[PDB]
């Protein structure tokens, strides 16, 4: 990652232009250029890199930061007590993982019901009214309700209303063996969603763009969305209200509450510059104002500015919904939960599965523990000045497997076996301690079979296949006999590993 520069990653639905303005002010004072980017799937891309060209700062809801901290991707932020007192202590709790602060909290987010005051003067208090309301609106060429059915974030409040939950809290922590995805409450909620689609009140294909376009053109009376969505509605001709989500079975819809958070990349050489920008430029009245102006943040973590914005009824409604909802866990298993429920809702909504089938798989998938160990492997190969005439060897090479992160791989790896071509003596080379590598000379390329064994003999060994590369394929580097580096990134995946093995992997 380039030094004397800040690269920031924020999601494309947030005020990235507003953030850029805070970056320009930072550049004005320090001379340090801030580059704000909104890459697709940044929250999936971040671990793949973070890095070479990974960001200095990453923005997301707090739910994903626990997984990043487990992998060791985040720097422990070091805000002074004077600074911590300026933000709401609730927001600090959301960015804490294993007793340590791993991100700066920016703003509290919750979904609200947004409705067209011209089309729908009195919004419905219940989900159960919406079919009737839609039939009445369909007669006038309009629809009652359209929201993102592709992302479980938007459908969860309905699923959770009558008893759906992610992880049961027990013994002072989230119990990841107790998932609340296929109980009567969850089934009732998703069934109500599936029935809306079966009855033509909603369309399984509806995504963020379609719902937003539909509501903002006055085609649908209602949508479900967060504060970030208000800017585009302002630009439209729609008179909108932000209100409490409809009740289901007489119980409030329970949106998962998000704390938009800024993490500092552990690989960043600009940790001090990141601290300065986040503490003294973004998390200020003027800084949050520039971002909020672009796309509203919700209830900001900075007390001073939250008090200035608190009187906005749209924020009051946001916090009303937040209070009836649940703070998202930040634990690593939240990733698995979100993917499982995304599958369940899309399959149930499309009609590939029944509600019972879809939620039974999600129950299993949400509880499936996956531990990922990124690795690098391959070879370096150096050309001799000239061919050694005795055995015709032209190259010295090292084949190797290394952890991608700076860790002791021998904590979970028992041994690595490198199977060389028959032309070598003792072709089965076994390495029981690091470094996991074999150095040799030769004349020829050939496939090396690499077999990685784990301390738990029941944990199935990983087999890798590597073509030992001696000769450069690039023509200019071929003419120049330049040193060959053929190495590959890969991730070893451990599924529901034994208790012993989980400790060794973490």
């Amino acid at each position: 990652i380039e030094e004397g520069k800040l690269v920031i990653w924020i999601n494309g639905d947030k005020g990235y232009n507003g953030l850029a303005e805070v970056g320009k002010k930072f550049e004005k004072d320090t001379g340090i250029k801030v580059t704000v980017e909104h890459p697709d799937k940044l929250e999936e891309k971040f671990p793949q890199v973070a890095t070479g060209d990974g960001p200095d700062i990453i923005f997301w809801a707090h739910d994903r930061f626990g997984g990043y901290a487990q992998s060791g991707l985040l720097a422990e932020i070091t805000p002074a007590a004077a600074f911590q007192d300026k933000l709401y202590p609730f927001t600090w709790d959301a960015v804490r993982y294993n007793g340590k602060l791993i991100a700066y909290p920016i703003a509290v987010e919750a979904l609200s019901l947004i409705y067209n005051k011209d089309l729908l003067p009195n919004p419905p208090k219940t989900w159960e009214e919406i079919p009737a309301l839609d039939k009445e609106l369909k007669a006038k060429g309009k629809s009652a309700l359209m929201f993102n059915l592709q992302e479980p974030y938007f459908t969860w409040p309905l699923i959770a209303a009558d008893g759906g939950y992610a992880f049961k809290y027990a013994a002072g922590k989230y119990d990841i063996k107790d998932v609340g995805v296929d109980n009567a409450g969850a089934k009732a909620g998703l069934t109500f969603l599936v029935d809306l689609i079966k009855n033509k009140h909603m369309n399984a294909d509806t995504d963020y763009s379609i719902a937003e376009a539909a509501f903002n053109k006055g085609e649908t009376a209602m949508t479900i969305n967060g504060p970030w969505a208000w800017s585009n509605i302002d630009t439209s001709a729609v008179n909108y209200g932000v209100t409490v989500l409809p009740t289901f079975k007489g119980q409030p819809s329970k949106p998962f509450v998000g704390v938009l958070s800024a993490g500092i990349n552990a690989a960043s050489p600009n940790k001090e510059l990141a601290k300065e920008f986040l503490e003294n430029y973004l998390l200020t009245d003027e800084g949050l104002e520039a971002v909020n102006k672009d796309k509203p943040l919700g209830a900001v973590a900075l007390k001073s500015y939250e008090e200035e914005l608190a009187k906005d009824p749209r924020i009051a409604a946001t916090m009303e919904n937040a209070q009836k909802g649940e703070i998202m866990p930040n634990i690593p298993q939240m990733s698995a939960f979100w993917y499982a429920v995304r599958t369940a809702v899309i399959n149930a909504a499309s009609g590939r599965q029944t509600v019972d089938e879809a939620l039974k798989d999600a129950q299993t998938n949400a509880a499936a523990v996956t531990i990922v160990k990124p690795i690098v492997y391959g070879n370096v190969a150096r050309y001799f000045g000239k061919k050694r005439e005795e055995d015709g060897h032209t190259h010295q090479w090292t084949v190797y497997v290394k952890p991608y992160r700076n860790e002791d791989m021998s904590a979970y790896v028992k041994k690595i076996q490198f199977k060389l071509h028959e032309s070598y003596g003792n072709p089965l080379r076994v390495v029981t301690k690091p470094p996991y590598e074999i150095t040799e000379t030769g004349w020829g390329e050939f496939e090396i079979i690499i077999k990685i064994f784990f301390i738990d003999p029941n944990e199935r060994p990983v087999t890798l296949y590597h073509l030992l590369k001696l000769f450069q394929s690039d023509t200019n580097a071929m003419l120049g006999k330049k040193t060959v580096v053929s190495e590959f990134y890969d991730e070893m995946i451990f599924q529901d590993p034994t208790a012993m093995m989980q400790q060794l992997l973490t």
């Binding site: 071509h421 028959e422 032309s423 004349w443 020829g444 390329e445 050939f446 496939e447 073509l467 001696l470 000769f471």
Partner: peptide
């Protein structure tokens, strides 16, 4: 085994 200068 498939060994050659380039494979």
């Amino acid at each position: 085994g498939g060994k050659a200068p380039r494979k």
